[PDB]
């Protein structure tokens, strides 16, 4: 016969299935923003 | 016209870039030499910064299980790196001839490419953030599925012990997400739908209370009806979480 999961087992599986690096990306995008804006500023003046 | 940037974080990063490029275009068309400085070092600084964005982007995507993120990210890497070569070439051109026409087209096209590419990279990470929220949402949807099998008060204790935390986590993710969006109509939709879900929580438990004690018909229909109404609201949330003007 099938060994069907208990309530507690069935719940824990669902929770497991569902439920700093972002700060680093934003930082690198701003540095990219800054460098490009400085480039355009030097070219335009401003 | 270029649409409003999706979130405030994205907006704060890219809006000054978009604004300065349109200014460059206007200057390029309406403007009129030896006043042009050497752009070799400035372009080199962009190239360096872009390179760092690509590396960090790879290290970040390296440590995820999101296979979609792994797939959609590399095209953005290519966009910004290609755009850099147009800037390098432009600086070299202007160094030889300050009046170089193709050099100016490269400067504009390369700057636009940096913006578009950085935009793609940010939207791709943003979509991965949304997918995490949706998983939490879908988990609760499936958690509501099992409300039908709770027949004892002890089982109701067990059921409530986990549903509460999950509800709280979801509510927190949606709250943090909504106040980041630049579209008011979407914020109010998310807030309202989440509020409806939260107030239907004690209703569900109370119905399961009287159903459990009764078993050991009216409470049967009331429970299922609550689950239905709660589920519909969460799916609506899922729909609004994915709404964007960038595609």
UniProtKB/Swiss-Prot annotation, chain A:
Function according to Swiss-Prot or TrEMBL: Associates with the cytoplasmic domain of a variety of cadherins. The association of catenins to cadherins produces a complex which is linked to the actin filament network, and which seems to be of primary importance for cadherins cell-adhesion properties. Can associate with both E- and N-cadherins. Originally believed to be a stable component of E-cadherin/catenin adhesion complexes and to mediate the linkage of cadherins to the actin cytoskeleton at adherens junctions.
Record text on subunit structure and interactions: Monomer and homodimer; the monomer preferentially binds to CTNNB1 and the homodimer to actin. Component of an cadherin:catenin adhesion complex composed of at least of CDH26, beta-catenin/CTNNB1, alpha-catenin/CTNNA1 and p120 catenin/CTNND1. Possible component of an E-cadherin/ catenin adhesion complex together with E-cadherin/CDH1 and beta-catenin/CTNNB1 or gamma-catenin/JUP; the complex is located to adherens junctions. The stable association of CTNNA1 is controversial as CTNNA1 was shown not to bind to F-actin when assembled in the complex.
Subcellular compartments: Cytoplasm, Cytoskeleton; Cell junction, Adherens junction; Cell membrane; Cell junction
Full protein: residues contained: 302 to 354 of 906
Protein name as it appears in the record: Catenin alpha-1
Post-translational modification: Sumoylated. Phosphorylation seems to contribute to the strength of cell-cell adhesion rather than to the basic capacity for cell-cell adhesion.
Tissue: Expressed in cerebellum, heart, liver, small intestine, kidney and placenta (at protein level).
Coiled coil spans: none
Family membership noted in the UniProt record: Belongs to the vinculin/alpha-catenin family.
From Swiss-Prot, chain B:
Tissue occurrence: Isoform Metavinculin is muscle-specific.
Membership in a protein family: Belongs to the vinculin/alpha-catenin family.
Localization in the cell: Cell membrane; Cell junction, Adherens junction; Cell junction, Focal adhesion; Cytoplasm, Cytoskeleton
Modified residues (Phosphotyrosine): 99
Free-text description of this protein's post-translational modifications in UniProt: Phosphorylated; on serines, threonines and tyrosines.
Signal peptide feature range: none
Name of the protein in its database record: Vinculin
Provenance organism: Gallus gallus
Function (record text): Actin filament (F-actin)-binding protein involved in cell-matrix adhesion and cell-cell adhesion. Regulates cell-surface E-cadherin expression and potentiates mechanosensing by the E-cadherin complex. May also play important roles in cell morphology and locomotion.
Domain notes: Exists in at least two conformations. When in the closed, 'inactive' conformation, extensive interactions between the head and tail domains prevent detectable binding to most of its ligands. It takes on an 'active' conformation after cooperative and simultaneous binding of two different ligands. This activation involves displacement of the head-tail interactions and leads to a significant accumulation of ternary complexes. The active form then binds a number of proteins that have both signaling and structural roles that are essential for cell adhesion. The N-terminal globular head (Vh) comprises of subdomains D1-D4. The C-terminal tail (Vt) binds F-actin and cross-links actin filaments into bundles. An intramolecular interaction between Vh and Vt masks the F-actin-binding domain located in Vt. The binding of talin and alpha-actinin to the D1 subdomain of vinculin induces a helical bundle conversion of this subdomain, leading to the disruption of the intramolecular interaction and the exposure of the cryptic F-actin-binding domain of Vt.
Residues of the full protein shown: 1 to 254 of 1135
Transmembrane domains' residue ranges: none
């Amino acid at each position: 016969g099938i060994q069907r999961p208990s309530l507690e087992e069935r719940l824990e599986s669902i929770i497991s299935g569902a439920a700093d690096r972002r700060e680093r990306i934003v930082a690198e995008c701003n540095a990219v923003r800054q460098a490009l804006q400085d480039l355009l500023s030097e070219y335009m003046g401003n | 016209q270029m649409p409003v940037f999706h979130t405030r974080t994205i907006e704060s990063i890219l809006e000054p870039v978009a604004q300065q490029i349109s200014h460059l275009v206007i200057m390029h068309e309406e403007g009129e030499g030896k006043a042009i400085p050497d752009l070799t070092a400035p372009v080199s600084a962009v190239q360096a910064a872009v390179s760092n964005l690509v590396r960090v982007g790879k290290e970040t995507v390296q440590t995820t299980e999101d296979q979609i993120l792994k797939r959609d990210m590399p095209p953005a890497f290519i966009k910004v790196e290609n755009a850099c070569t147009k800037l390098v070439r432009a600086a070299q051109m202007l160094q030889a001839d300050p009046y170089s026409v193709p050099a100016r087209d490269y400067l504009i096209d390369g700057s636009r490419g940096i913006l578009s590419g950085t935009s793609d990279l940010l939207l791709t990470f943003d979509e991965a953030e949304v997918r995490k929220i949706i998983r939490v949402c879908k988990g609760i949807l499936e958690y509501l599925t099992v409300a039908e099998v709770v027949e004892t008060m002890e089982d109701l204790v067990t059921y409530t012990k986990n549903l509460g935390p999950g509800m709280t986590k979801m509510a927190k993710m949606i709250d943090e997400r909504q106040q980041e969006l630049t579209h008011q109509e979407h914020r109010v939709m998310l807030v309202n739908s989440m509020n409806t879900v939260k107030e239907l929580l004690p209703v569900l438990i109370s119905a399961m209370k009287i159903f459990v004690t009764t078993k050991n018909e009216e409470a049967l229909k009331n429970r299922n009806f609550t689950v239905e109404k709660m589920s519909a609201e969460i799916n609506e949330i899922i729909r609004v979480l994915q709404l964007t003007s960038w595609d």
